[PDB]
Structures are given as structure tokens and as C-alpha cells.
Amino acid sequence: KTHVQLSLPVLQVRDVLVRGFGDSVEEVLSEARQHLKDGTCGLVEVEKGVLPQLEQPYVFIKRSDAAPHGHVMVELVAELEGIQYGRSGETLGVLVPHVGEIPVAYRKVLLRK
Ligand SMILES: COC(=O)[C@H]1CCCC1=O
């Protein structure tokens, strides 16, 4: 399947134990996809002061279309020192590893895999 329905746990930035996926744009996109596939991926909603508390490169989910079965269609865009690799819509949040943090909510997405 080109798209996979996922329910992503929404985490508070201060709860996040593992604050990024790795050390290169290509590694963070790889790791983000593996965690999304393995159900070990969380989402942090981007507000004032969030991104400086997380590790670059960042992996964003961005809205890729204007929402089957409640699931917003999204794709991955990485960012490192103000340059983005990919082009998409509005940020739904920044992905991080999930290692058992308690979420505040769930974000239903259809991920272009
Ligand atoms: C069924 O596979 C999945 O869960 C997706 C996640 C991203 C890659 C993939 O195969």
C-alpha cells in the first residue's frame, strides 16, 4: 500500500526522552519511517519554544492534501539548519521516537509510505 492509516500519540515536548531520530537528514527520514512502520513514533505539536527543545535534523509531518476515514494525508519533510528536504503543506507536528511517554491525544494520519 502507498498509504498506511496511523494513530500517532501526541506527546508534550518536556516528556520526550529521545529528542530526534539521528544525525543526518537521510538518517532521520529513514528512522522516522521505520518507527512509523513499527508503531514506535510520537508527534509533538509545534508552538513557540518547542523546536529548540528538540534535536536537529527535525522530521515534520506536513498535510499533503485537503482526509479519508478521519485520517489527514501527510508526508515527511526533514529540516537541518533552516533547509527543508521535501516540499509539502502545513506542519501537523514534529516526529520523535516514542519510548512509552503518556500522550495527551492521538493524531489520525494517512502516511504516504
Ligand atoms: C505496513 O507498513 C507500515 O506500517 C508502513 C509504515 C511506513 C512504512 C510501512 O511499510
Domain holding 67: CATH number?
2.30.30
Record the cell numbers describing residue 108, joined without a space. Answer: 489520525
Q: What is the resolution of this structure in A?
A: 1.9
CA of 33 from ligand 1 middle (Å) equals: 7
Count of C-beta atoms within a 10 Å radius of residue 57: 22
SS3 99: coil
Q: Which domain holds residue 89?
A: 3-112
C-alpha triplet 58, 84, 101: angle, nearest 5° = 15
Question: How many domains would you assign to the chain?
Answer: 1
52 DSSP 8-state letter: G
Method of determination used here = X-ray
| Element spanning 60, H or E | strand 58-63
CB contact at 8 A, 112 and 106:
no
CA distance linking residue 15 with residue 3, whole number of Å: 29
Record the cell numbers describing residue 65, joined without a space. Answer: 492534501
**Smallest CA separation from ligand 1 atom 4, residue:** 37
**Smallest CA separation from ligand 1 atom 6, residue:** 37
